[PDB]
Ligand binder design. Structure first.
Ligand SMILES: [Co+2]
Ligand SMILES: [Co+2]
Lengths: 330, 330
């Protein structure tokens, strides 16, 4: 069987319903008249043009069959996060978006599984919303990797991680609100450069701060897009931790020892990159993810893993094995 | 023989000489009374503590012997660049720093080779200063990877690159003035996260803009610290260029075809990282560099390459071969 655990949705959101939250920065979905194309829109600006598969759960199951993917986990498009908003307005919006998600997963909840979003800019509202959603049916939460200038070392974000680790709630960490200000203007560089760095920063933020020494080993946490550039740059981190007391102060073990404490999806779009990745993470902590349905997500879902020189057991774990232990799937 | 082509110096600069340029932003060297320790200082603030090898070319040759490195190329500590300054002041400062460099390399110019800095914020002054310096003895120029919000795609920086390509001047591109604003506060995250992303952005900036289709093939250009995270994330770039017309518009060939047009140093601090790197770049475009004398530079210079499963011939090219064609060292 095949489980793709990194994919996204966007719900049937009217201009009128989103304007009631923020007729300026609440995102909404405009579908064409035919009904197989459309755009995500902030106020009345065009944000991203999207395909029917993003919002239509029936059309999506049909593609899932063409693709040979049996169960697919899916979660909010990072533009739905609303972390910049006021906390009550975001807790309201999060509640609707996760309802929409169960509504979307209704089309076939043995094959479509959902992850919820939280108002992460408020620890209390984020914690209650995380537990409600798992009880309502979501298999876990998906969070942006940072919150303005708070990275995952921030005490509040660590508190949200521990809360989930204690309630045995799995977490997918997604790059979002990328760094870099005004420089990565064209050629989609924010996805090519800033996305991988954002992820690496999140992972390194937990490690070098000692967060893993303080968070329960029971936390199920996954970092998207191969964990950014983390695995390739890990040796540069180990060498700095050995040669610099300020790198070493909050981190008792050498940083590569902590790879036993988190997961990554397999989306790295290259056999060499994939082989190095499992070499660092181990075949048990790499899962099949595709970033479906966006252009940048590997058309042939699972094709990179299946054509690899990896073990037949390694393939089985990335394709299916680890994603069902991680998410508790039949 | 061994050639380490990535290393740095800092000259004997007094508080008062630096104050005549900017008693606020000009860096200077304070040596202890003993004289084997010291600090780089901006105005009156402590910037980096350094050790004798950074400024003492005699002490350095002695360590060069202990380390078994025959010739070492060296260049300015990126804090010396002064790209934020007024152009004439910076052209004045660059001229003194490159004189200092030849003064430093005087201690033994058959083992210490130098690269010059330029006032890159002024294309004319940068071009004259680049040619000046090569004629005075430098083997080429070292530049920060970006200039505020101008990346190597910027037409000024492209004009500086082709000026050098036409005068057959080699270029080492160094990450500097790292992105990330206020987030990577502690654990030296700017060196771990932002430095590799800066490099990757520079390389990708030339490729995806078509700069390599417009710059003469004769350009000898090298990117530091293994070219950042570029070689690992290259497949993500290829896949984006195939699936997105806006990634593809300015770039006629698929982006991984352009690895035949630049070099990288070998400083990636890991055998798997190193093996993937030469797999992407080819054994001919990877050169031994150590970032000596900073804490984060592999104290066993060349030790990573020599202990690798790479070919006897690959080792000879990285250790010695490529760095002497590139730099014209006999
Ligand atoms: Co995604
Ligand atoms: Co350096």
């Amino acid at each position: 069987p095949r489980i793709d655990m990194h994919s996204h949705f966007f719900p049937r959101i009217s201009e009128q319903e989103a304007a009631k939250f923020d007729a300026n920065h609440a995102p909404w979905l405009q579908v064409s008249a035919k009904g197989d194309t459309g755009s995500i829109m902030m106020g009345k600006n065009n944000f991203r043009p999207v395909y029917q598969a993003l919002w239509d759960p029936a059309f999506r199951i049909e593609e899932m069959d063409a693709q040979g993917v049996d169960v697919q986990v899916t979660c909010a498009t990072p533009v739905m996060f609303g972390y910049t908003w006021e906390a009550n307005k975001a807790a309201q919006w999060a509640e609707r978006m996760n309802d929409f998600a169960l509504e979307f997963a209704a089309a076939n909840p043995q094959r479509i599984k959902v992850l919820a979003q939280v108002p992460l800019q408020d620890l209390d509202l984020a914690c209650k919303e995380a537990s409600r959603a798992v009880a309502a049916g979501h298999l876990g939460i998906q969070i942006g990797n940072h919150l303005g200038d708070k990275d995952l070392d921030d005490a509040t974000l660590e508190a949200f991680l521990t809360h989930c680790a204690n309630e045995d709630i799995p977490i997918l960490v997604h790059p979002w609100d990328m760094m870099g200000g005004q420089r990565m203007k064209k050629w989609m560089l924010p996805w090519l450069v800033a996305m991988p760095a954002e992820t690496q920063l999140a992972i390194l933020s937990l490690i070098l701060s000692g967060a893993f020494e303080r968070i329960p080993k029971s936390l199920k946490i996954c970092f998207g897009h191969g964990g950014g550039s983390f695995a390739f740059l890990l040796g540069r981190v180990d060498n700095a931790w050995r040669h610099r007391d300020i790198v070493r102060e909050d981190c008792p073990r050498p940083p590569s020892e902590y790879v036993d404490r988190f997961f990554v999806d397999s989306a790295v779009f290259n056999p060499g990159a994939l082989e190095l990745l499992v070499s660092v993470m181990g075949e048990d902590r790499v899962m099949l993810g595709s970033d479906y349905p966006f252009p940048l997500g590997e058309q042939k879902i699972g094709g990179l893993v299946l054509s690899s020189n990896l073990g037949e057991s390694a393939k089985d774990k990335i394709i299916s094995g680890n994603a069902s232990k991680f998410f508790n799937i039949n």
